[PDB]
Enzyme design. Sequence first.
Site: not given
Length: 129
Positions: A35, A46, A48, A50, A52, A59, A101
């Site tokens: 990462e 990102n 969209d 967003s 990280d 994110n 999650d």
Amino acid sequence: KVFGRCELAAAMKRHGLDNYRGYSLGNWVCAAKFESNFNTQATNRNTDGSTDYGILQINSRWWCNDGRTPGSRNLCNIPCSALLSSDITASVNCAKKIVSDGNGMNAWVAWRNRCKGTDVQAWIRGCRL
Ligand SMILES: [Cl-]
Ligand SMILES: [Cl-]
Ligand SMILES: [Pd+2]
Ligand SMILES: [Pd+2]
């Protein structure tokens, strides 16, 4: 801060990531390696809009507030900048919630595509833990 491999392994161990939700410490070290290359200051935008952040590339779409991700969630209840700190607590604590999650560590695409099913124990080989 750019962490040493064993240095990160030990910090993560102290924060209770070793076998957290059944993910051995090597999984977490492997995920951070692919990462961020162990760089707490790592950031990536990102498609969209967003972003990280940090050692585990958490994110802003769901997990943190960066002031620039319209309609996002802040499920870890932190400013994203908190994930760039030399103190990994905010990233580790947030990562604990993420891995709870439904998808587990599959939430980290780098984990899935580079760590999952590999010898992740190689990542902590020789470290004093
Ligand atoms: Cl808040
Ligand atoms: Cl601390
Ligand atoms: Pd709050
Ligand atoms: Pd701290």
